[PDB]
Amino acid sequence: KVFGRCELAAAMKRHGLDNYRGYSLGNWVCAAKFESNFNTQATNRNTDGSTDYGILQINSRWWCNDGRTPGSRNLCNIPCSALLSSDITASVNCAKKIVSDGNGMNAWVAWRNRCKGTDVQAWIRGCRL
């Protein structure tokens, strides 16, 4: 599924991401734009042979099992395929475990480089939540 900006903001709000670990909704919408262009089916190979999956490009090295990342961990206890569903629940619940692990949203390179320190409120302006 490719989400509209305001549709994803509402969905992320429903799943309890607004101010989760103190990250406003705008931070989460900004991260998803730059990670996946709002596409739940986004996949990208990493140089190290791991793959990033879904709206927030969750990495098979640490977080999910895709059967072809040798010597990786599955800290969210899910098949990476679960992170590609039109249903964003599995991506949100895993994102909560990642952002809670001591590096906050710095775990997302695109958040660090394109969202952090910016007016992220602009990502949710004009949306009914």
Place this chain on the structure above:
Amino acid sequence: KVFGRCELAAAMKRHGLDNYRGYSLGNWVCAAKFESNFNTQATNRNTDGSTDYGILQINSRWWCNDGRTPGSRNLCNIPCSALLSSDITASVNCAKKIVSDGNGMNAWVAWRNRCKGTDVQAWIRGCRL
């Protein structure tokens, strides 16, 4: 789809029913419980040969076309079948036209007899919206 109480409250909130024409979310959840038991696929024949459809039991006499209610109107400009979808959008948009037509939620008999004058806030207690 059979909704959970809190799931439907959130969905109705997302579709802009909270305080629509001044009816709190609890009024809408209470009406859906007593009309359909939260089942989007609910259908009931009326004595007059019309049929009520969906989570809010919208009547084919006035509001939707089902092809077998002779001399009825289609004021919501939809096939009644649209009101049975797991997607509550068509039911919500038609419910807005009904509640705006001068009788407010008295259009729903079950609301008048079981919700009106009661502590409807109890229908949304314990829900994350």
